[PDB]
Enzyme design. Structure first.
Site, PDB file in Angstrom:
ATOM      1  N   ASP A   1       0.865  -1.162   0.000  1.00  0.00           N
ATOM      2  CA  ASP A   1       0.000   0.000   0.000  1.00  0.00           C
ATOM      3  C   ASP A   1       0.914   1.229   0.000  1.00  0.00           C
ATOM      4  O   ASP A   1       2.097   1.125   0.352  1.00  0.00           O
ATOM      5  CB  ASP A   1      -0.880  -0.049   1.253  1.00  0.00           C
ATOM      6  CG  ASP A   1      -1.731   1.195   1.435  1.00  0.00           C
ATOM      7  OD1 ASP A   1      -1.664   1.785   2.540  1.00  0.00           O
ATOM      8  OD2 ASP A   1      -2.469   1.592   0.500  1.00  0.00           O
TER       9      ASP A   1
ATOM     10  N   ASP B   1      -2.146  -0.524   5.922  1.00  0.00           N
ATOM     11  CA  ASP B   1      -2.603   0.138   7.148  1.00  0.00           C
ATOM     12  C   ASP B   1      -4.100   0.423   7.147  1.00  0.00           C
ATOM     13  O   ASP B   1      -4.651   0.876   8.147  1.00  0.00           O
ATOM     14  CB  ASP B   1      -1.846   1.458   7.336  1.00  0.00           C
ATOM     15  CG  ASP B   1      -2.278   2.516   6.345  1.00  0.00           C
ATOM     16  OD1 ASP B   1      -2.382   3.692   6.725  1.00  0.00           O
ATOM     17  OD2 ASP B   1      -2.534   2.180   5.173  1.00  0.00           O
TER      18      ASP B   1
ATOM     19  N   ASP C   1      -6.937  -2.893   2.836  1.00  0.00           N
ATOM     20  CA  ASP C   1      -5.805  -3.815   2.704  1.00  0.00           C
ATOM     21  C   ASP C   1      -6.143  -5.172   3.322  1.00  0.00           C
ATOM     22  O   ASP C   1      -5.378  -6.127   3.184  1.00  0.00           O
ATOM     23  CB  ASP C   1      -4.547  -3.234   3.369  1.00  0.00           C
ATOM     24  CG  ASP C   1      -4.037  -1.979   2.672  1.00  0.00           C
ATOM     25  OD1 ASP C   1      -4.193  -1.878   1.437  1.00  0.00           O
ATOM     26  OD2 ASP C   1      -3.483  -1.082   3.353  1.00  0.00           O
TER      27      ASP C   1
HETATM   28 MG   LIG Z   1      -2.919   3.073   3.483  1.00  0.00          MG
END
Ligand SMILES: [Mg+2]
Ligand SMILES: *[C@@H]1O[C@H](CO)[C@@H](O[C@@H]2O[C@H](CO)[C@@H](O)[C@H](O)[C@H]2NC(C)=O)[C@H](O)[C@H]1NC(C)=O
Ligand SMILES: CC(C)CCC[C@@H](C)[C@H]1CC[C@H]2[C@@H]3CC=C4C[C@@H](O)CC[C@]4(C)[C@H]3CC[C@]12C
Ligand SMILES: *[C@@H]1O[C@H](CO)[C@@H](O)[C@H](O)[C@H]1NC(C)=O
Ligand SMILES: [K+]
Ligand SMILES: [K+]
Ligand SMILES: [K+]
Lengths: 268, 992, 39
Positions: free
Chosen positions: B345, B686, B690
């Site tokens: 990410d 995070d 995700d």
């Molecule tokens: Mg992120």
């Protein structure tokens, strides 16, 4: 193939052949040096045989010899081992002044034939007649068990002195020259009868010390025949034969450390 | 099952408000009926998420109790009770042997079960985190009246109302809104507020303004909407199910464990039954044939090995806990070392997740600011009088403020009330000009025009802090081009000057460059109003232009971006040097995604996309050979119409990949694509978007401070300080533990041979038993334990970060080379050293080696209390047994003595001990404690009963010393050959 | 000696055990010292 090619299969064989060959050659080398540090006449350690064991001829199934008097093949098993032992104490086996000697027909003192050396021939052993074993095919009724003290090189079995009290209190106490053997069971439902050298219920000290198989082959250890002409029948009788001495001790674990454990039963 | 959920969603934002009501039998104004709502409740079911069915811990524990070694140990334990049963019936055996050994072995299985159970842990509460995002209550309009209801009682069709501060209770079709902004970070990973209005604004429902989603929250304003989806049927409720439903799967390390279990189990059953028949042929009673088999089992199975592995893993996880890297699953300690591809990410992972000033354009010059958290860069300018003029506008023409009580925390980390751009500017000036509040106190704001959608600028009028003036200063900021159309002069190095086409062109150049860097650019200008035309009491009208807004003085430009975390660029390069492929997978827009890719080193300098080639050469993209482009940037909207085979080609054909504007399922798809090619993949993230990717990853790593609760539930590892450098450490630790496990496994296995061989020679030679079954467990469960563990503290023999990731198909934890060395070479030398001491003990007590062959018959005969030794002496039963058990004790101690050398040689696979040294203090500890344990077990009174351990004479300890030394020399010579010729012979044969 | 060679069939297993246990303990202490050089 499985793993590799033929060329690789060969090389892995040539390696392990030389490798294991070397290892075998090294192992043997260390065995050589071990042997080189040892005597031919006497073992390095003797503390593990120290207190002599007492073993008998009747091959006990489990410290027991039960059979039927009214049956032939009921005791023919115990007579096999009994014969095996006494067959060794033949007179034809003890011929000439070599390597046997006529010793006192009465319990005598020790005999030192020098040291544990080869500086002399075969150390001459005392003769022993199976004919000293009175009364004992064997006892088809009321067995005639034969006792034996385990051989230990350089061991001098020392009898107890009549200073204080004794089990068989002072009776026929040949204090100086006899290692006594008194069998027991309370529970006194038997009839103990002992046979041996000089008519004594012990081991004549003139058969000691033992010089070992290498310095004394054909050597004969003293026997003590014991007969139980018990007037009882059809019951397990726990009979314990005990030897007494200064160098004799016992253990709760080793039930053969200077004593017997016989479970006779004339179930007839 | 979940293949449906891996697809992009379909919606009804295209319908009119009225049309949408027909579909759901609803009223736009009155809302649903109390009766109709309750009807729909029973129909569709609750607005809730149901957690997936889990496997109870019962079945999880017992599943370990039947994995190769435990199976063999079970066969042994029962076979003990078998022989015991056969005894208790036949001849009354007052002993406890088979009974107790059967109890001991069954305990070994249970305890070993706990260790593997502890290792195979799965702490997963994905669906629980998602459930936390549904509010307890919602506001609905029913029978023309608004009431709060249990949010679970919400159904498709009713009229819902939301306002700033509340969570979207369900997927809504916006029908009415007033200044409504929403935080869609759940779906995008981006927290910038998105406007919501009734008007449809994109074909894509995840981008349109007239849809609001469950799992997000309203940030400001008010909105009303019609519920289109409820519970599991919402967009993120499906993501929830997808994430929670995904099959976990076996880790690389787990697969390795099972693999050597098969090997060792194989040789165990082989030799087991190979000698079971070999005994019956020799005329051994089944009574004995089973007793030998039990011994064979115990000899072949390394009883303490699986627990060693677990402890070595645990100890490695403890070290990483001490670098702010939390491991939730013990196996994930190794996966990072086997990782060949990282899918990362961007926002909050690679980046700080905070709009930060990156560059400034003043004095016809581009200046760069420091974007790093801890400010690890340098200054750009302080001297220029122009800077102070620009700095003043950035502070004054700004409505952002620091939250109360932050004075303790660093400037860049403190919470700010305001939009991202104003916060960035605030923190910029506060950093390099001190307290901004001071500047806003020295220059009192009298009138302002806040940033307007139409004006595209924000202006402010302040009392000049200067005493000699104390007059009125005008400042404004806005779109760079709009600010330009309002300027006549430029503050160059202090003094103003006319805005000639020259500087105007340099402005465009500066503007295009900063924008090309993916940075948001703002214009800044001011104007000192004429004193005579503006008295100290002159009133300014903000509603109607009461003051000039043209012919102003352009001061400068400022650019900003959500920047990389300081450690990220360097960590990315380090991953790439270790041969790990790094891919970006983000919900963010392509221009931003691509710019950070270059910033952190995902896309290296000079590498081009097909679009780059086309623009440079000024040719159509179809005219470009796509193989000429090693880099690519894929938008999610294009990803959607590509098959997996085509996704596989993208993955194969590019070294530098950026997946931008991806949905959560799309991240999962990219991860699966990478895995499909046979790669071990890590995911770093995070956000809740995700979660599926993190779950599917061989190892998911979540950020600890910036991470959402969901992401950290889906992960195997948490970076508690958001230190991306930890990934680099993790992969390094992962590789090191992999090598050290080999060392520890070889060490443990090596001692199997000296435990097997005595039992074999017992049969083939008919000699007294050299070593007992109990004695074996004193080794594998006792002495070898701490030494085997200590190998986990071994330093690397070379630069492990310099090698490529292991090939999980070829590079195994236990291979033929390990067995050859442990079983064929070193263990064989240990066996002899054991036997030697055995022959020494017996020969020194009177039983010379020659007379031992074929004596076991009379030796074991309990009724022969007069066995003749070599010297003609007679032994009772218990007497010779004491010597025999003393033989077991010295054979045992011989193993310990030969394991000394083995421990030292297993220290290194390649290097010499003279190179690696002896700096492992745990290992040395192992040596001392191992020897202490052995001595205690031999000399402690009473151990001769409980373990049949007998006191050894001093000379006995030294029997195996020459064998211990040969091992050290042999292995040192062998490894000397390895190093001296990287060719292959010694290497390809023995190099673990 | 001659008939008084009782020492030939004797071993001080008691002292050996005392010494063996002393050694085991001291090796245990030494190990702790080296391990605790940093914990
Ligand atoms: Mg992120
Ligand atoms: C040791 O003495 C025993 C005494 O019983 C011998 O047994 C003799 O066996 C033969 C042939 O089987 C019989 O004819 C005799 O009746 C047995 N007794 C005697 C006194 O001769 C046995 O053969 C002898 N063993 C050896 C090796 O000489
Ligand atoms: C007690 C004694 C008699 C048993 C001796 C067993 C010997 C023959 C065994 C023990 C370990 C074995 C080796 C272990 C490892 C390998 C590597 C593998 O790729 C091919 C087989 C090979 C080379 C084995 C061949 C046979 C081997 C050398
Ligand atoms: C033993 O045998 C002798 C003959 O040799 C006999 O006189 C005696 O009665 C026997 N003794 C016993 C107790 O039976
Ligand atoms: K084992
Ligand atoms: K995972
Ligand atoms: K082992």
């Amino acid at each position: 193939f499985l793993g590799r090619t033929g060329s690789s299969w060969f090389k892995i064989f040539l390696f392990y052949l030389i490798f294991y060959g070397c290892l075998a050659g090294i192992f043997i080398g260390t065995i050589q040096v071990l042997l080189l540090t040892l005597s031919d006449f006497e073992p390095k350690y003797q503390d593990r045989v120290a207190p002599p064991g007492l073993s008998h001829a009747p091959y006990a199934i489990k410290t027991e010899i039960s059979f039927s008097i009214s049956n032939p093949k009921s005791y023919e098993s115990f007579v096999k081992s009994m014969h095996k032992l006494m067959d060794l104490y033949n007179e034809s086996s003890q011929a000439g002044n070599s390597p046997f000697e006529d010793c006192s027909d009465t319990p005598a003192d020790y005999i030192k034939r020098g040291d544990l050396d080869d500086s002399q021939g075969q150390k001459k052993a005392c003769r022993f007649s199976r004919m000293w074993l009175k009364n004992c095919g064997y006892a088809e009724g009321k067995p005639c068990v034969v006792a034996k003290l385990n051989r230990i090189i350089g061991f001098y079995p020392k009898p107890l002195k009549n200073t204080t009290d004794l089990p068989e209190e002072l009776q026929a106490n040949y204090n100086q020259y006899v290692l006594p053997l008194r069998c027991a069971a309370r529970e006194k439902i038997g009839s103990i009868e002992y046979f041996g050298l000089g008519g004594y219920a012990g081991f004549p000290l003139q058969y000691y010390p033992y010089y070992g198989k290498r310095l004394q082959k054909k050597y004969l250890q003293p026997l003590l025949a014991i007969q139980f002409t018990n007037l009882t029948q059809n019951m397990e009788l726990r009979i314990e034969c005990k030897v007494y001495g200064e160098n004799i001790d016992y253990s709760e674990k080793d039930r053969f450390r200077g004593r017997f454990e016989v479970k006779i039963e004339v179930k007839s | 099952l979940d293949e449906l959920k891996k697809e992009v969603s379909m919606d009804d934002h295209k319908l009119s408000l009225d049309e949408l009501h027909n579909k759901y039998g609803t009223d736009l104004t009155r809302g649903l009926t109390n009766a109709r709502a309750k009807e729909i409740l029973a129909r569709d079911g609750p607005n809730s998420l149901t957690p997936p069915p889990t496997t109870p811990e019962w079945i999880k524990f017992c599943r370990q109790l039947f994995g190769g070694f435990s199976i063999l140990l079970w066969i042994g334990a029962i076979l003990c009770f078998l022989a015991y049963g056969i005894q208790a019936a036949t001849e009354d055996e007052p002993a406890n042997d088979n009974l107790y050994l059967g109890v001991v072995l069954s305990t070994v299985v249970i305890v070993t079960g706990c260790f593997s159970y502890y290792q195979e842990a799965k702490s997963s509460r994905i669906m629980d985190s998602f459930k936390n995002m549904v509010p307890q209550q919602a506001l609905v309009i029913r029978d023309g009246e608004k009431s709060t209801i249990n949010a679970e009682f919400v159904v498709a069709g009713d009229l819902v109302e939301v306002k700033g501060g509340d969570r979207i209770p369900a997927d809504l079709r916006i029908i009415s809104a007033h200044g409504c902004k929403v935080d869609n970070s759940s779906l995008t990973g981006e927290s910038e507020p998105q406007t919501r209005s009734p008007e449809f604004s994109s074909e894509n429902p995840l981008e349109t303004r007239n849809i609001a989603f469950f799992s997000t929250n309203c940030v400001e304003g008010t909105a009303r909407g019609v519920v289109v989806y409820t519970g599991d049927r919402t967009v993120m409720g499906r993501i929830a199910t997808l994430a929670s439903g995904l099959e976990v799967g076996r880790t690389p390390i787990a697969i390795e464990i099972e693999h050597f279990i098969h090997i060792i189990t194989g040789v165990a059953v082989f030799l087991g039954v190979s000698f079971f028949i070999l005994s019956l042929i020799l005329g051994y009673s089944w009574l004995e044939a089973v007793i030998f088999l039990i011994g064979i089992i115990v000899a072949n199975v390394p009883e303490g090995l699986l627990a060693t592995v677990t402890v070595c893993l645990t100890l490695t996880a403890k070290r990483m806990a001490r670098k702010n890297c939390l491991v939730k699953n013990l196996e994930a300690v190794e996966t990072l070392g086997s990782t060949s591809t990282i899918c990362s990410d961007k926002t909050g992972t690679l980046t700080q997740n905070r709009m930060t000033v990156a560059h400034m354009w003043f004095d016809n010059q581009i200046h760069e600011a420091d974007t790093t958290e801890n400010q690890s860069g340098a200054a750009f300018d302080k001297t220029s009088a122009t800077w102070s003029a620009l700095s003043r506008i950035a502070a004054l023409c700004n409505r952002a403020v620091f939250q109360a009580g932050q004075d303790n925390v660093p400037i860049l980390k403190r919470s700010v009330a305001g939009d991202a751009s104003e916060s960035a500017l605030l923190k910029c000036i506060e950093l390099c000009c001190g307290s901004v509040q001071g500047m806003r106190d020295r220059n009192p704001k009298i009138v302002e025009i806040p940033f307007n959608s139409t004006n595209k600028y924000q202006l402010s009028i302040h009392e000049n802090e200067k005493s000699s003036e104390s007059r009125y200063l005008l400042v404004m900021k806005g779109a760079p081009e709009r600010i330009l159309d309002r300027c006549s002069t430029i503050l160059l190095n202090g003094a103003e000057e006319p805005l000639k086409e020259d500087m105007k062109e340099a402005f465009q150049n500066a503007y295009l460059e900063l924008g090309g860097l993916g940075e948001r650019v703002l214009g800044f200008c001011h104007f000192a109003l004429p004193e005579d035309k503006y008295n100290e009491g002159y009133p300014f009208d903000a509603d109607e232009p009461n003051f000039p807004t043209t012919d102003l003085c352009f001061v400068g430009l400022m650019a900003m971006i959500d920047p990389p975390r300081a450690a990220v660029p360097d960590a990315v390069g380090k991953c790439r040097s270790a041969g790990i492929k790094v891919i970006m997978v983000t919900g963010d827009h392509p221009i931003t995604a691509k710019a950070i890719a270059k910033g952190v080193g995902i896309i290296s300098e000079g590498n081009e996309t097909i679009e780059d080639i086309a623009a440079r050469l000024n040719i159509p993209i179809g005219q470009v050979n796509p193989r000429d482009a090693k880099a690519c940037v894929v938008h999610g909207s294009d990803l959607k119409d590509l098959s997996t085979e085509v996704l596989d080609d993208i993955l194969h054909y590019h070294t530098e990949i950026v997946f931008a504007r991806t949905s959560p399922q799309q991240k999962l798809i990219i991860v699966e694509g990478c895995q499909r090619q046979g790669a071990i993949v890590a995911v770093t993230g995070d956000g809740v978007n995700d979660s599926p990717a993190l779950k599917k990853a061989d190892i998911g790593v979540a950020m600890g401070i910036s991470g959402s609760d969901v992401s950290k539930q889906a992960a195997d590892m948490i970076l508690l300080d958001d230190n991306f450098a930890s990934i680099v450490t993790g992969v390094e630790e992962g590789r090191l533990i992999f090598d050290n496990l080999k060392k520890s496994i070889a060490y443990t296995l090596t001692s199997n041979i000296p435990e097997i061989t005595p039992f074999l020679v017992f049969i083939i030679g008919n000699v007294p038993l050299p070593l007992g079954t109990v004695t074996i467990l004193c080794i594998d469960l006792g002495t070898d334990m701490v030494p085997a563990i200590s190998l986990a503290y071994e330093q690397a023999e070379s630069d492990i970060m310099k090698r490529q990731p292991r090939n999980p198909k070829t590079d195994k934890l236990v291979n033929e080379r390990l067995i050859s060395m442990a079983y064929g070479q070193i263990g064989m030398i240990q066996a002899l050293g054991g036997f030697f001491s055995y022959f020494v003990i017996l020969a020194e007590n009177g039983f010379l080696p020659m007379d031992l062959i074929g004596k076991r018959v009379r030796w074991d005969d309990r009724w022969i209390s007069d066995v003749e030794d070599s010297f003609g002496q007679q032994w009772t039963y218990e007497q010779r047994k004491i010597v025999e058990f003393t033989c077991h004790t010295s054979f045992f101690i011989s193993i310990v003595v030969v394991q000394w050398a083995d421990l030292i040689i297993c220290k290194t696979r390649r290097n010499s001990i003279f190179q690696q040294g002896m700096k492992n203090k745990i290992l040395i500890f192992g040596l001392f404690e191992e020897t202490a344990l052995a001595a205690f077990l031999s000399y402690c009174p009473g151990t001769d009963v409980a373990l049949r351990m007998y006191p050894l004479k001093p000379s006995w300890w030294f029997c195996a010393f020459p064998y211990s030394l040969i091992i050290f020399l042999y292995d040192e010579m062998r490894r000397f050959i390895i190093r001296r010729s990287p060719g292959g012979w010694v290497e390809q044969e023995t190099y673990y | 000696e001659g008939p008084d060679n009782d020492e030939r069939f004797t071993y001080d297993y008691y002292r050996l055990r005392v010494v063996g246990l002393i050694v085991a303990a001291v090796l245990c202490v030494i190990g702790i010292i080296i391990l605790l050089a940093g914990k």
